[PDB]
Design a protein around this ligand. Structure first.
Ligand SMILES: Nc1ncnc2c1ncn2[C@@H]1O[C@H](COP(=O)(O)OP(=O)(O)O)[C@@H](O)[C@H]1O
Ligand SMILES: O=C(NOC[C@H](O)CO)c1ccc(F)c(F)c1Nc1ccc(I)cc1F
Ligand SMILES: [Ca+2]
Ligand SMILES: [Mg+2]
Ligand code: NA
Length: 314
């Protein structure tokens, strides 16, 4: 199920061939073109690598650690030259300079689902059908070919492009970048599974929880917890809480659900199986790959690119 079609292998050859030409990356070959976003640990720019004339996204993680330290992150990050899939954001390289690590990657012109959502109000189920397939394959790719678990699925980490492509970024490839960062730097745990917030055991089932959580959010047009009190719904389809108060909700209350009557039963069952609190019972990748919603969604020929440009003005 990880086979590429012809239009995918070609895009993959194209990318590599462009990459082949990029020598060693250095601060001075880059020129800011715009700011794509900021995070609780770094910034991201749409930049032009002058020599090659390549546009990229430059993530600058302004975290400070001795050249001794930062050289291990850069080491495990080199693994990204091995992550070639249609569902994974392309990587150009990583270097240190100015007390900040730079991770340069393929530029996704449609932005993150994060922003697609803000623009669109809510994403139609058939679209989320393709997003679901893409995440499932992205995580199946990373597990099968690199024994990696994503670790941070959320709408801001699923990126799309005018070619109708859906790819994942920000996955836990370097454990050292994880600790060297996930220390004096937090990044929202609001899409973390109950088991990871409880400290307990955690596999790719945790990533499945976050995907399910994200899909409900994208489907309804709002971060789903706590639940939209019935009258909140009539305004929605016709038909506050501090961080710590919320994470506690997740661990102690029943998982979110899609409002009924509005979405198909296959799609409700799909998210319900992702949102199962006990990891042992919640579906896994192999099961989700053959879920009715995924099989129906695949055979569907949805024009993701059309819908996208039409919605964000692309
Ligand atoms: N490869 C990319 N192409 C386009 N935009 C990107 C890319 N990578 C990151 N971004 C943008 O950067 C914003 C913030 O990046 P980030 O620092 O990872 O914080 P979060 O991921 O917590 O938003 C993201 O929401 C996204 O819009
Ligand atoms: O960048 C990461 N998380 O978010 C960072 C902050 O939000 C900055 O604001 C992150 C965490 C662990 C890890 F191992 C990585 F490799 C990371 N970055 C990262 C991963 C894959 C690709 I393709 C490109 C990337 F850039
Ligand atoms: Ca410089
Ligand atoms: Mg991100
Ligand atoms: Na610089």
């Amino acid at each position: 199920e990880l086979e590429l079609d012809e239009q995918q292998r070609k895009r993959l050859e194209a990318f590599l061939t462009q990459k082949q030409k990029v020598g060693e990356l250095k601060d001075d070959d880059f020129e800011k073109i715009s700011e794509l976003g900021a995070g609780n640990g770094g910034v991201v720019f749409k930049v032009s690598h002058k020599p090659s004339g390549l546009v990229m996204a430059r993530k600058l993680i302004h975290l400070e650690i001795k050249p001794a330290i930062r050289n291990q992150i850069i080491r495990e990050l080199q693994v990204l030259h091995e992550c070639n899939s249609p569902y994974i954001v392309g990587f150009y390289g990583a270097f240190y300079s100015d007390g900040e690590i730079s991770i340069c990657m393929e530029h996704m012109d449609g932005g993150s689902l994060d922003q697609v959502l803000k623009k669109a109000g809510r994403i139609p189920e058939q679209i989320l059908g393709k997003v679901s397939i893409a995440v499932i394959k992205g995580l199946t790719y990373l597990r099968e070919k690199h024994k990696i678990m994503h670790r941070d699925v959320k709408p801001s980490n699923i990126l799309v492009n005018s070619r109708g492509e859906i790819k994942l970024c920000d996955f836990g490839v370097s454990g050292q970048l994880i600790d060297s960062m996930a220390n004096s730097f937090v990044g929202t745990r609001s899409y973390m599974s109950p088991e990871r917030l409880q400290g307990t055991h955690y596999s790719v089932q945790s990533d499945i929880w976050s995907m399910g959580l994200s899909l409900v959010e994208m489907a309804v047009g709002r971060y789903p917890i706590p639940p939209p009190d019935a009258k909140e719904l009539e305004l929605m389809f016709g038909c506050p809480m501090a961080i710590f108060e919320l994470l506690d909700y997740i661990v102690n209350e029943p998982p979110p659900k899609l409002p009924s009557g509005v979405f198909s039963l296959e799609f409700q069952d799909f998210v319900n199986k992702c949102l199962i609190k006990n990891p042992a019972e919640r579906a896994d990748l192999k099961q989700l790959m053959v879920h009715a919603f995924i099989k129906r969604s695949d055979a569907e020929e949805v024009d993701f690119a059309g819908w996208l440009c039409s919605t964000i003005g692309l």
